[PDB]
Structures are given as C-alpha cells and as structure tokens.
Ligand binder design. Structure first.
Ligand SMILES: [Zn+2]
Length: 253
DNA sequence: AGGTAGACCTGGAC
DNA sequence: GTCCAGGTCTACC
C-alpha cells in the first residue's frame, strides 16, 4: 500500500490491539524477520510485552510495545488482521502474534516480501530501516528549502531525486509521477535545473497529492495512450531512473 | 567514501 | 522454465 493506505491501517489497527499482551509468537517464514536475524530471538523477546501504540513512518508501521518497537513494512501485498485463535488461519499467514485474550494479530503476505525488525524503542529510529528516512511529507520538516537544498546538490533527474527515501518519506513511483504532473515538471529534467519557482510548486503539489489521499483519480500513472485529463494530449510512458515513467508532454516542461 | 544505481524478497501468471 | 512486481538499503566505485 501507499503512505495514505498505511495511515488508514495504522488508524484502524490500533484500537484492535492496544492494551493487549503477547503470549506467543509463531513464525512460519523466518526470512520475514530481519532483526534480530535469529527469528527465535525475535519471538522470545516479544513474549509478555503489551501493545501500547502504533505509529507510521513513511510506509513503515511502528508497533510500540513495553520495551521494544516492531517496525513492519508490508511491501507489495502484506496485510494484518486481528482474529480469534480458535479459527483456521487464512492462506499465506507467515507471522502470528498471539495475545493473552485469545485473539491474534496475523500477518499475511503472498509474495513474502514484507519485513519485520524489532529493537528497543530508543534505538529504532537510529537503526535500519528507519535510519536515514527523510521527513514526513505532511510535516513542516519537509519544506521547499529542504527540497531545494537537495536539488541544487545532485546530478540526478528530478524523478530520481524524489524516489530517494532520504529526501522525503513515502514517495514511490505513483506519487512521484502524479506530483510531477500536477506541478508541470518533466520527470527527466535535472533536479538542479528546477527554478526556485518550480521547487516551490513541486513541494506544494507533493504535499497536496499525499494530503488529499490521506484525508480522502490518477492523471498520468498507468494512463499511457489515454488523453490527458487537463489538455487531452495522449499520456506517454518512458524509462527514467530505470523506472516506468508516465507524463504529459504538453502540461509538463 | 559520499553519492548513485539498482539488486533483491518470492509466488503467481505467461 | 521465464518474467513480473518495486521500494529501498546494499553495494559499487
Ligand atoms: Zn496535459
């Protein structure tokens, strides 16, 4: 899921698990557990901790327990559900946290691409994968100044810049293409070639793009061959930053 | 060795 | 048997 849907999961999951105490952890695909590397230590350390909170950083969910934080990335098709220990697990269930009240937090993932890392709370932010993660796009910490500073410094295309997780959190292929379209900037342009006016406009559209989605219709992403919604020009697709890239050659410059 | 490009977690679909 | 999905932390220099 994208950032806005991860925020929805964060908001919806929290009341279903807050205040519950872990009694067991069952792991059916150890490779999902990335820290501690030994999934046995992962399972053992969580036992007896109570869920106190659930936060989001970029696309990462951060489950706050007593001593530890569990940092979870759903990647492609990871999903969490809360259900009774008495019911059969659903297909592709790879990790299960059993609570003392007979309920369970289940993690399902067809591709097995998701990741889990557990650290002491006070360490989580300075260890992978959260270490280096850029500012939240909806936060004052993500500013035109910050964006301009990174743009003027690189030889990369603007798209490559915006896909860099250290620049800003939670921007992937879709929102990058959409933001660039709304700002009227071609994705293949050198980041350093953007005028201050363009940086300001891109910042504004980046914020509106994720902002409208987190609170609540694509212009270019996956619409190649179809008419642009603003000028009717056919949307085109190329490779930029080694990625499938969608844009309107008339609206964007 | 800082900045960058892009390698890699797998099952499902071709 | 081959290829795709893809964000991001690795690894290349
Ligand atoms: Zn257009």
């Amino acid at each position: 899921p994208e950032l806005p849907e991860v925020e929805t999961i964060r908001r919806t999951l929290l009341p279903l698990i807050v205040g519950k105490t872990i009694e067991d952890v069952r792991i059916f695909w150890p490779n999902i557990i990335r820290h501690p590397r030994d999934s046995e230590a992962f399972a053992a350390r969580m036992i007896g901790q109570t869920v106190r909170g659930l936060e989001r950083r970029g696309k990462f969910l951060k489950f706050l327990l007593d001593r530890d934080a569990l940092i979870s990335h759903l990647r492609m098709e990871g999903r969490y559900a809360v259900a009774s220990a008495l019911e059969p697990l659903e297909p592709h269930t790879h990790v299960v946290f059993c609570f003392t009240d007979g309920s369970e937090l289940r993690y399902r993932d067809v591709r097995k691409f998701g990741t889990m890392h557990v650290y002491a709370k006070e360490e989580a932010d300075r260890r992978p994968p959260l270490a280096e993660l850029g500012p939240e796009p909806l936060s004052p910490a993500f500013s035109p100044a910050v964006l301009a500073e990174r743009a003027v410094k690189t030889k990369r295309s603007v798209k490559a810049l915006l896909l860099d997780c250290t620049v800003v959190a939670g921007f992937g292929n879709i929102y990058v293409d959409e933001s660039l379209f709304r700002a009227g900037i071609l994705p293949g342009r050198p980041a350093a070639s953007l005028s201050s006016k363009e940086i300001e406009r891109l910042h504004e559209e980046m914020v509106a793009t994720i902002g409208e989605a987190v609170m609540k219709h694509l212009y270019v992403y996956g619409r190649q061959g179809n008419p642009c919604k603003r000028c009717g020009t056919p949307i085109e697709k190329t490779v930029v930053a080694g990625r499938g890239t969608h844009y309107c050659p008339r609206c964007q410059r």
